[PDB]
């Protein structure tokens, strides 16, 4: 079933990621968006096995209405930065927890990117995921005020209950 | 109005975190910017951050280094995305900076960029990209600046 | 009443702050224990941290992983003796959480010890070696706890 | 008679114990300071330690770099507390000194500060504080410090 | 026509790439050198890798530091074997540059040397090896260079 | 006759370098395996490097862990392309595996890939695209394996 | 009578400190093996230590994880060779163990070896060889010991 | 000028490295080597550049009535364990300061060797190279008591100077 009809269930968020087995990580900052009712869309798109695909994906994205890209990734992590090369739009990098250096390698290759091309790093893994779910949201929020409103309700359940 | 704030722990940082500014002067974005120590002013650190969203502000961009909580403990009183800028501390080059910043736990993201200068300067374009993601003549700046760059170094 | 406070970010650090705590029954030492975020619950780790000293605390043990702000936090808004326990994080095996605490600035120093277990235990054996400086009954207490591991050992 | 203890393993660490003497000094703490080296003086050292409660110390701090030993021997040796300062050492910047000094096992705590003169400063306001959970006078000259330090931090001039 | 493709992600990684093109030259080796950003101008960095072969290049010698994505996103797109030179970065000494580069997943090689000049050297070394698994000329030109440094090393005081 | 030779320290090496071996297979590269140990052979290693030329292999894939020398020494005493597979220790997980290997001084080339089996895999790749440099046919059987791992993935 | 004496925190230290013993059984050499703590029994460290020597001893071997301060306490007190032997540490997998044992400062060498089982194998080789660099029948053992293993991996290993 | 002539002039120790440039770091064990009057050689010996000369060397070394080798390298720093490799004498590692990693690669590269093949490996830079020579005098001490003695003074000596 197709939502073409529905402008609010269009794609805000693309959450994409080198490989399926990241899927273990980036699952979570798709959890948050669905609990927050964000219109989203997730795919493997490989900075190194996909090359050319990662750029046509970076490039048209803004056109297709997203407004912000969730990208995993590992090891020699990549494509964080390279989409964010290819587009203007604000790019969100979760670190995915590599074998040898848990995750090292991929917080580097992510968070250290030259002048003129910023990645929004989050932490290694779980959390991170989670968090660029968060502020993918928290981005969407500047400009509309429910989805802000939304946020801040959510932190105040989990202070509550954390607190008590 | 201010549509973002600037902030930093101590003065010194100042240094680091002039680049950010250059940008948004740049990219005519109106911004303030203060020290505000996570630390040594943690009060004022917590009433900034609580009023940003009253006062007009959509993003905060805030450095430190070392033990550098300024940015996590900003981001836990505001839903404002914040950015962290990883100051190059003394002994450790900023790896200390940059793991007080990167890692924050799941429900208080910060949107954490490089170590030093190229992180400040990013930090600008970040938050340029988020005003610019809902304000098209923002994201054409931000266009135009990157294809004067691609010409540059191209040719 | 309570004499040291124990406070963690989240209950799953509660595994490694109870070895402080087994410490402080160890040698009858009046404490209390509770879950403080620094990032989930902001506020109220500042009214705990305020509070503190009216309430009776002579020291605080905080436990906390990967940022790791609540040890520096709680320092920056009490002059009680602040001991910090890195908790040991799933990636990056608690150098994050020791960075994160060890690294304050001037003004606002944490007590920092080992990651893990080792460090919880010291937290306690450190809050009575603060209170046995004043308090002949503790000190003769952790001298006799020496001694006999010293024995047991040797022999 | 002396209530903090500052001792280092060589000369060329007082460049980084300074600072903790300074603080001692504008809070009229009495102190001692002097060389106390775990491998050149390993005797001195264990003397030193095992001495101080005696001599009327509370509080000890001991800076050292590389193989930071000095901190953790003390402490092995007596249960006032210790401070461990991680002075910065020329080829790993003070990592080496860091592990060496904050990864104590269980028995043997020592408190850990920050590597360098950030981390002396704060080993005086620690046993600054350790005395003040008894001295009501210092902690009250902590918490007005403090307060001094905010009041000139958030009233600054503005930044150009 | 040039053998070997020279590239590197500023004008500021010169300084460290020149050692690599010192190599080529010394040995007589025809090659190529530009400033290529991964991250600066990635149109170009594609056309660049895709083109090579066609353009008679045999080896790419890639320069980048911090998260140093050239060498990487280069073998992504040609089959030529690519030598990555991890550019000594201010903060972190190498060490993103290293690991940027190095820690390639399946599928897509990058031979990577040393931090900094050393690494840069060997680039131009390892070029000439490869080229030297077939050209016999530069195989033996490389023993007699390393037979020479040898004799100088060892009797050197 | 064999063209690439691939070595390994110990036997327990062969669960890492067999990934190499399994692209050569698939290549239909001829190729030859072997324990080749630094620190145990190292007169073998010596023997081995020196007449790898004369016997008719054109690259050397190495692979080592801990101290690992072998890639190193071996290319010192061929001038063969020689590349090197740190494999993951267990203390370290590679990173004293990756050192050993990559920082070759000037002279002395290895070209290092990834710790462990991705890096394995690479290994063999890289063997084929030195091959490939001078043989059309494998070099447009390298394409065509992209080509079919890029339709799979994207599809 | 013993000529190497092998050394521990802790009896959970033997899993690694075995393989040093190991090999000083297997060149019949004679040792002694004990727990001995830097920071549990610093006294009795200085008394083994400082009595080594008039008791025959011609190397220690010491094993220490995490704040490993008992090879280089020790070395401060005698002039026999002393080897650390880095303990792998739970957190920091004995990078902790590493560098608080190797980064020993000019005056007080500790010979150190690999990080865990590999290590521990080594410093009893290393003992060995400090003893066989003056006595031929040790010499023998060890050229014989790497012979046979040489001969082993080349004439063995074969793949599959 | 040659010594053939005096047992007690022939080397017992060998000091060598893989460059000219680690003298400077190298020197300090020779200067404790003079002040034991221990007899020494120094030289550079490449484990990279000058492969077949450095196993001539380790081979030899023995028979030549070296006691004990002390090798300094850095970055990839081969030339201690592969001299290992080579003889049973006891061999001391210098891990030599180097550009980028300030000697960590040169540490681990030296001190992680396998079992089988020991290197006693001291501190990164020149106050390893001190301790290289006391090592190397310690080791000698344990067969000879006057270089032993000669120890014991030299360190009584430091300890009174830096306890007053």
């Given amino acids: 079933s197709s939502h073409h009809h529905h402008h609010h269930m269009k794609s805000l968020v693309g959450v994409i990621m080198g490989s399926t087995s990241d899927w273990e990580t980036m699952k979570y900052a798709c959890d948050i968006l669905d609990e927050l009712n ?8 490989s900075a190194h096995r996909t090359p050319d695909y990662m750029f046509e994906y970076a490039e048209t994205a803004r056109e297709r209405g997203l407004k912000v890209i969730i990208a995993g990734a590992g090891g020699a992590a990549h494509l964080p930065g390279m989409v964010a090369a290819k587009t203007n739009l604000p790019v969100i990098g979760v670190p ?28 290694i893994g779980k959390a991170g995921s989670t968090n660029a779910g968060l502020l993918a949201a928290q981005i969407l929020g500047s400009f509309h005020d429910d989805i802000h409103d939304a946020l801040e309700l959510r932190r105040e359940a989990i202070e509550k209950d954390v607190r008590e």
Wanted: positive net charge; glycine residues 8%.
């Fill in 38 to 45: 964000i219109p989203y869309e997730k795919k493997v798109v």
């Fill in 96 to 123: 995915v927890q590599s074998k040898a250096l848990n995750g090292l390698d991929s917080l580097l290759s992510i968070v250290q990117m030259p002048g003129g091309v910023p990645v929004a790093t989050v932490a």
